[PDB]
Amino acid sequence: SSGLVPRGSHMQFVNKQFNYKDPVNGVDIAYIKIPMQPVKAFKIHNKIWVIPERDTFTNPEEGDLNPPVPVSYYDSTYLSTDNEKDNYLKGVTKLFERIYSTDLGRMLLTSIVRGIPFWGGSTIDTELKVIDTNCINVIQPDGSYRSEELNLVIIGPSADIIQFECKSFGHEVLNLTRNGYGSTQYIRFSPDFTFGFEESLENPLLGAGKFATDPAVTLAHELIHAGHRLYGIAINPNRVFKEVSFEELRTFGGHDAKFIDSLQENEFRLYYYNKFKDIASTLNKAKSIVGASLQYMKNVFKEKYLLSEDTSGKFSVDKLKFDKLYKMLTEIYTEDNFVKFFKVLNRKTYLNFDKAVFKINIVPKVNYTIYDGFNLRNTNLAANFNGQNTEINNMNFTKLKN
């Protein structure tokens, strides 16, 4: 019926088949508070939680869901009911399993899980310490709570329902997404809507068709930004063509990313190489830790950053391992490469989308599968990306008014 386990006995990334109504347990279902009344959240994997709520939490200005760019869509009512929250959670779950079904997705999600935000929180130069906004408070059934570090939170969108994004809490002094440290990433995302694009496929009287973006591709896109931002190698959003940012071109990948000139790219690579050397020096100068042995935590970050260690125990950045990690996160993890792996239809450049928004339901296996998306094998929808064609597969896409 839902199709969460097409091969084997159990899901391979997501740890449980949650229902929204499952009681809180303080372990993988808990009321949590972000650095607000608590919100029910689900731990889908080590370091990754899902909050099936509209994001009225992360940005203080954006506390309401009413209307005050090309395409936007508002419904204050979306994701207000337990049934919707259940369907959100199962849809996100399904999309994670779809991403993890690919070699590329397994590489990306591993990198994300391993990309623990750096403990650069001390004003004492020789002391390691967590940064408080890289945690959440996990309330237990008896009301006690513990702070838990995490890497990624998937949350529902704020007022603009199709405004998907990867954001995070800043430091008053540190630029965490651009200094190698990284920070917990919050992805505003809905599996219940998608957007359109036009494509002309190839009998002769077929003009341009109207297709829908596969929401596994959209989520992977945001997961790719999360990877850059967790290893603190995001491109400054003030770097743009004008509009499309360098960071978006990089993340879309394919030919779009080739418009970032190689001289520019060499410059960023060197910049972040030096930021990683700074992290190795800081770890080396560390003498104490607050809030696990110092030796243990240093090693956590040697593991994250692929640091080399001599017989003294001194760390250094290896140039070949740095290049590997940097190339993985920035060149190999791209929307274009996920498109190739999924074998789905996608727009051919970042800006080439329609001002068309659709309600979808990906949870029923009769609508969308982990292996095929909307393009269900052994049906009319396997041919010519007909499952993503909003005319042919009209039952799966309800066009919304912009």
Ligand SMILES: O=C(/C=C/c1ccc(Cl)cc1Cl)NO
């Ligand atoms: O790139 C984005 C969002 C992109 C986006 C959001 C909404 C629509 Cl309709 C189309 C697009 Cl390409 N977030 O990282």
Ligand SMILES: [Zn+2]
């Ligand atoms: Zn993006």
